[PDB]
Swiss-Prot record:
Keyword list, A-Z: Cytoplasm, Cytoskeleton, Disease variant, GTP-binding, Lissencephaly, Microtubule, Nucleotide-binding, Phosphoprotein
Its job: Tubulin is the major constituent of microtubules, protein filaments consisting of alpha- and beta-tubulin heterodimers. Gamma-tubulin is a key component of the gamma-tubulin ring complex (gTuRC) which mediates microtubule nucleation. The gTuRC regulates the minus-end nucleation of alpha-beta tubulin heterodimers that grow into microtubule protafilaments, a critical step in centrosome duplication and spindle formation.
PTM-bearing positions, type Phosphoserine: S116
Residues annotated as transmembrane: none
GO molecular function: GTP binding; identical protein binding; microtubule nucleator activity; structural constituent of cytoskeleton
UniProt name for this protein: Tubulin gamma-1 chain
Amino acid sequence: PREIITLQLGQCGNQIGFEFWKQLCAEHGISPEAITDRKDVFFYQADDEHYIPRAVLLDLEPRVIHSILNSPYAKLYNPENIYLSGNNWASGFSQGEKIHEDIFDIIDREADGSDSLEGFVLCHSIAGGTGSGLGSYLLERLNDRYPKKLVQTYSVFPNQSDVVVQPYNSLLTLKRLTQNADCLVVLDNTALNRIATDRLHIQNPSFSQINQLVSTIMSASTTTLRYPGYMNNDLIGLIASLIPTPRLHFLMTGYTPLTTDSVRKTTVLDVMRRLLQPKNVMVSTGTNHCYIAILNIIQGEVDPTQVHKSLQRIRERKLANFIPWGPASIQVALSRKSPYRVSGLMMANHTSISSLFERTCRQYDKLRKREAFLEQFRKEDMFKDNFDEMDTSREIVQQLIDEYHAATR
Ligand SMILES: Nc1nc2c(ncn2[C@@H]2O[C@H](COP(=O)(O)OP(=O)(O)OP(=O)(O)O)[C@@H](O)[C@H]2O)c(=O)[nH]1
Ligand SMILES: [Mg+2]
């Protein structure tokens, strides 16, 4: 009975968000407006026996939000939750301070509506301006206006440019994602593509097509909260299981049934089996590294006897290389689906996730060791360098994540 409020920022933020609410709606049998599962967690009971999502659509430009509003779901969202006011993280981190008040009026209100709020989900992108700039700002404010309230995020990492400063905004955000966020579901645009392109066969994969994937995961990873059971009914119940120590709290995901249309047999076996095949992992990396915990959420019929049998085959084929300094264990979670074949979702805190952070700095340093485009960011309270404060921090994240693969740990 724990509520979750969702903050959607920037195009990226608000587009994976649109899809997100399109997906959950389908499941809970809600129409683009209104109507045993737990809807409360993500929805609110309208003053007309109808439904509306606990979502805050924030953007610094009208284009994207009006597409949603001039769409089939315009009637779903809570009108007073839609806010509209730069390209730079500085410009984004900026206006937030400017829009602060106007924003929390919507944030604190939904914050009231909830009786037992757990925390916040922030959909957004790391590159870009608003998502990172405004988003980093919120992540700092949220960490004060609500100190106990947990914070998770679905952060979209850029593909592999055409922004020029992605490596800037990105570092400046990864910081606020390291210390001002409890859980960090990492969505790698590169990885999303490969799939869309490969395991789907689309030469020029669009964002709609790409976001269709993200919705699936954004959707699956929250099934145990919406079709609740005895164990795993708190968001903190999931994250806790995936985060032994702080900082190290960046996860990577993956889904099994991705294509086709018949097979001879598809059991939970080849479902857990594939979730470890990196080809299905939505992140890009390039011995040593190992998982720090693994979760698998299977939907539909399963009979927990078969599951023990699947783990064993893994233990002997050594398919999963876990940490050396502790209990190598993967958690399964047999969740339901909505009343409308198997299906599996993996969420892991794996070491090589440091790879993306590394891939970002090298780009940063390079662009930094030339004082590149520093003219636009230094255009508002960047009369020195918070930049350095961030790099160092991010380096810490790469330091512990690697140090995490050492038996010493
Ligand atoms: N998966 C996914 N990635 C996206 C989507 N839209 C943008 N991105 C990525 O996210 C970044 C773009 O953020 P937008 O550019 O979407 O948002 P911020 O709002 O950029 O920009 P400004 O408001 O102009 O400051 C780039 O790294 C894009 O590759 C989307 O719908 N889905
Ligand atoms: Mg934008």
